[PDB]
Design an enzyme around this catalytic site. Structure first.
Site, PDB file in Angstrom:
ATOM      1  N   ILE A  11     -10.811 -20.317  30.690  1.00 40.33           N
ATOM      2  CA  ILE A  11     -10.756 -21.810  31.202  1.00 40.33           C
ATOM      3  C   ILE A  11      -9.626 -22.352  31.237  1.00 40.33           C
ATOM      4  O   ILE A  11      -8.923 -23.017  32.062  1.00 40.33           O
ATOM      5  CB  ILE A  11     -12.003 -22.293  30.586  1.00 40.33           C
ATOM      6  CG1 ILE A  11     -13.430 -21.837  31.217  1.00 40.33           C
ATOM      7  CG2 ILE A  11     -11.974 -23.806  30.778  1.00 40.33           C
ATOM      8  CD1 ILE A  11     -14.768 -22.431  30.694  1.00 40.33           C
ATOM      9  N   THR A  15      -5.241 -27.671  22.614  1.00 39.46           N
ATOM     10  CA  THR A  15      -4.279 -27.926  21.637  1.00 39.46           C
ATOM     11  C   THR A  15      -4.455 -26.859  20.370  1.00 39.46           C
ATOM     12  O   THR A  15      -3.565 -26.232  20.003  1.00 39.46           O
ATOM     13  CB  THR A  15      -4.366 -29.203  21.104  1.00 39.46           C
ATOM     14  OG1 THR A  15      -5.598 -29.876  20.980  1.00 39.46           O
ATOM     15  CG2 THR A  15      -3.258 -30.273  22.077  1.00 39.46           C
ATOM     16  N   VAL A  19      -9.789 -21.655  25.444  1.00 41.97           N
ATOM     17  CA  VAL A  19     -11.293 -21.790  25.725  1.00 41.97           C
ATOM     18  C   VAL A  19     -11.588 -20.906  26.832  1.00 41.97           C
ATOM     19  O   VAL A  19     -10.784 -20.660  27.710  1.00 41.97           O
ATOM     20  CB  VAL A  19     -11.487 -23.121  26.291  1.00 41.97           C
ATOM     21  CG1 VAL A  19     -13.221 -23.551  26.803  1.00 41.97           C
ATOM     22  CG2 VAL A  19     -11.073 -24.243  25.115  1.00 41.97           C
ATOM     23  N   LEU A  75     -19.165 -26.473  32.287  1.00 41.63           N
ATOM     24  CA  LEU A  75     -19.096 -27.424  33.446  1.00 41.63           C
ATOM     25  C   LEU A  75     -18.173 -26.556  34.277  1.00 41.63           C
ATOM     26  O   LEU A  75     -16.858 -25.907  33.846  1.00 41.63           O
ATOM     27  CB  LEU A  75     -18.859 -28.542  33.329  1.00 41.63           C
ATOM     28  CG  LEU A  75     -20.258 -29.548  33.096  1.00 41.63           C
ATOM     29  CD1 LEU A  75     -20.441 -29.544  31.516  1.00 41.63           C
ATOM     30  CD2 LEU A  75     -20.053 -31.298  33.567  1.00 41.63           C
ATOM     31  N   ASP A 119      -7.953 -39.057  23.186  1.00 40.94           N
ATOM     32  CA  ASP A 119      -7.148 -38.146  23.967  1.00 40.94           C
ATOM     33  C   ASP A 119      -7.631 -38.230  25.202  1.00 40.94           C
ATOM     34  O   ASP A 119      -7.831 -37.025  25.902  1.00 40.94           O
ATOM     35  CB  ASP A 119      -6.776 -36.893  23.518  1.00 40.94           C
ATOM     36  CG  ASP A 119      -5.860 -36.048  24.427  1.00 40.94           C
ATOM     37  OD1 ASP A 119      -4.426 -36.848  24.591  1.00 40.94           O
ATOM     38  OD2 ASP A 119      -5.673 -34.998  24.542  1.00 40.94           O
ATOM     39  N   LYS A 121      -8.211 -38.009  29.423  1.00 39.98           N
ATOM     40  CA  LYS A 121      -7.144 -37.625  30.444  1.00 39.98           C
ATOM     41  C   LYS A 121      -8.077 -36.910  31.360  1.00 39.98           C
ATOM     42  O   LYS A 121      -9.211 -36.429  31.171  1.00 39.98           O
ATOM     43  CB  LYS A 121      -6.303 -36.789  29.938  1.00 39.98           C
ATOM     44  CG  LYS A 121      -6.430 -35.578  29.201  1.00 39.98           C
ATOM     45  CD  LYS A 121      -5.390 -34.743  28.693  1.00 39.98           C
ATOM     46  CE  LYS A 121      -5.771 -33.575  27.805  1.00 39.98           C
ATOM     47  NZ  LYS A 121      -4.631 -33.202  26.640  1.00 39.98           N
TER      48      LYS A 121
HETATM   49  C1  LIG Z   1     -11.917 -29.450  29.927  1.00 35.56           C
HETATM   50  C2  LIG Z   1     -11.635 -27.677  29.478  1.00 35.56           C
HETATM   51  C3  LIG Z   1     -10.234 -27.705  29.419  1.00 35.56           C
HETATM   52  C4  LIG Z   1      -9.750 -26.646  28.606  1.00 35.56           C
HETATM   53  C5  LIG Z   1      -9.340 -26.939  27.277  1.00 35.56           C
HETATM   54  C6  LIG Z   1     -10.145 -28.032  26.645  1.00 35.56           C
HETATM   55  N1  LIG Z   1     -11.825 -27.699  26.825  1.00 35.56           N
HETATM   56  N2  LIG Z   1     -12.609 -27.318  25.724  1.00 35.56           N
HETATM   57  C7  LIG Z   1     -13.645 -26.979  26.346  1.00 35.56           C
HETATM   58  C8  LIG Z   1     -13.660 -27.265  27.830  1.00 35.56           C
HETATM   59  C9  LIG Z   1     -14.913 -27.084  28.635  1.00 35.56           C
HETATM   60  N3  LIG Z   1     -14.491 -26.778  29.871  1.00 35.56           N
HETATM   61  C10 LIG Z   1     -15.428 -26.544  30.795  1.00 35.56           C
HETATM   62  N4  LIG Z   1     -15.375 -26.160  32.053  1.00 35.56           N
HETATM   63  C11 LIG Z   1     -13.901 -25.919  32.797  1.00 35.56           C
HETATM   64  C12 LIG Z   1     -12.907 -26.970  32.491  1.00 35.56           C
HETATM   65  C13 LIG Z   1     -11.728 -26.657  33.082  1.00 35.56           C
HETATM   66  C14 LIG Z   1     -11.568 -25.588  34.076  1.00 35.56           C
HETATM   67  N5  LIG Z   1     -10.383 -25.433  34.534  1.00 35.56           N
HETATM   68  C15 LIG Z   1     -10.398 -24.462  35.867  1.00 35.56           C
HETATM   69  C16 LIG Z   1      -8.901 -24.249  36.148  1.00 35.56           C
HETATM   70  N6  LIG Z   1      -7.751 -25.084  36.050  1.00 35.56           N
HETATM   71  C17 LIG Z   1      -6.588 -24.744  36.331  1.00 35.56           C
HETATM   72  C18 LIG Z   1      -8.031 -25.802  34.813  1.00 35.56           C
HETATM   73  C19 LIG Z   1      -9.398 -26.402  34.501  1.00 35.56           C
HETATM   74  C20 LIG Z   1     -12.911 -24.596  34.236  1.00 35.56           C
HETATM   75  N7  LIG Z   1     -13.698 -24.932  33.497  1.00 35.56           N
HETATM   76  N8  LIG Z   1     -16.623 -26.679  30.524  1.00 35.56           N
HETATM   77  C21 LIG Z   1     -17.259 -26.987  29.409  1.00 35.56           C
HETATM   78  C22 LIG Z   1     -16.010 -27.390  28.536  1.00 35.56           C
HETATM   79  F1  LIG Z   1     -16.303 -27.634  27.222  1.00 35.56           F
HETATM   80  C23 LIG Z   1     -12.197 -27.567  28.118  1.00 35.56           C
END
Ligand SMILES: C[C@H]1CCCCn2ncc(-c3nc(Nc4ccc(N5CCN(C)CC5)cn4)ncc3F)c21
Length: 290
Positions: A11, A15, A19, A75, A119, A121
């Protein structure tokens, strides 16, 4: 531990660790699995119960060997990707107003439990097809820290850092999340970053050029902050009407209270929920492709 999960796809690279999207081999549940590579145990466990519809639910905390695993609800998309896909026409204001309203609800819930995000964003704001938006990467900042480089050495963005953090305040308050949410508010309206700085002093000076260099008049005690310098250039304050056009007067009034220099003058999440900008708030359905 790791045996019960099947790694679907990567995903993102936070830091502390990486994930993955994962499938619980036994229950079929699709989750976001965070691998944190190695006090914090009890602080993370204090987030198992920080449950709210606008907070990404922390399902389980797996602790085996020298590796730590966090299991979150999954998500499909962050706010950043949705803003990029909406760059040509802009996110409709009713949807902007709904996301801001829900995030203030989530913030008001965590600040009443003395939990800061530290943090905020667009990259850790997650949306679904139902019109909901949730806060992610929540509470981990106090458990480990907000470092300068990730484990993949990528630079941590400063675009949403509150000025008291940039000025070296050791014990900042909940107002730092209101500032970051205000910068995200502006970026959704204008489809451009409010303060896109690439260094701490460039981030600070970009804030100064827009809101004026702070002094004791607008921020009592700013001249005593650890990183304040009297040699700071003195820029005059730009008018808010040029900062976020074409946001209406309700929205500009709310944004200016979220961007007050003095953290004690900055509007709280609970007080912002009563702002007349949300008099006509609804919950629209976004245009998502997954
Ligand atoms: C916010 C993320 C960012 C990744 C590092 C921080 N962190 N820790 C948990 C999650 C998380 N993420 C998701 N879903 C998700 C989020 C981002 C993405 N990508 C798709 C490809 N893009 C190039 C970037 C974003 C896909 N799926 N669900 C539930 C979660 F707890 C995240």
């Amino acid at each position: 531990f790791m045996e019960n999960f099947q790694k679907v796809e990567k995903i993102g690279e936070g830091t502390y660790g990486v994930v993955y999207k994962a499938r619980n081999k036994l229950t079929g549940e699709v989750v976001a699995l965070k691998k944190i590579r190695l006090t914090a145990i009890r602080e993370i466990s204090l987030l198992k119960e920080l449950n709210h519809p606008n907070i990404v639910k922390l399902l389980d905390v797996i602790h085996t060997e020298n590796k730590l695993y966090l299991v979150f609800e999954f998500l499909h998309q962050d706010l950043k990707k949705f803003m990029d896909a909406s760059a040509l026409t802009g996110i409709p204001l009713p949807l902007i107003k709904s996301y801001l309203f829900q995030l203030l609800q989530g913030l008001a819930f965590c600040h009443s439990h003395r939990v800061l995000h530290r943090d905020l964003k667009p990259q850790n704001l997650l949306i679904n097809t139902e019109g909901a938006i949730k806060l992610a990467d929540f509470g981990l900042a106090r458990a480990f820290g907000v470092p300068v480089r990730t484990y993949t050495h990528e630079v941590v963005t400063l675009w949403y850092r509150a000025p008291e953090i940039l000025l070296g305040c050791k014990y900042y308050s909940t107002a730092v999340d209101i500032w970051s949410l205000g910068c995200i508010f502006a970026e959704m309206v204008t489809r451009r970053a409010l303060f896109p700085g690439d260094s701490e002093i460039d981030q600070l000076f970009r804030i100064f050029r827009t809101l004026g260099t702070p002094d004791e008049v607008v921020w009592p005690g700013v001249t005593s902050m650890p990183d304040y310098k009297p040699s700071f250039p003195k820029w005059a304050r730009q008018d808010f009407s040029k900062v976020v056009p074409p946001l209406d007067e309700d929205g500009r009034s709310l944004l200016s209270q979220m961007l007050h220099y003095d953290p004690n003058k900055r509007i709280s999440a609970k007080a912002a929920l009563a702002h007349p900008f949300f008099q006509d708030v609804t919950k629209p359905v976004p245009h998502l492709r997954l």
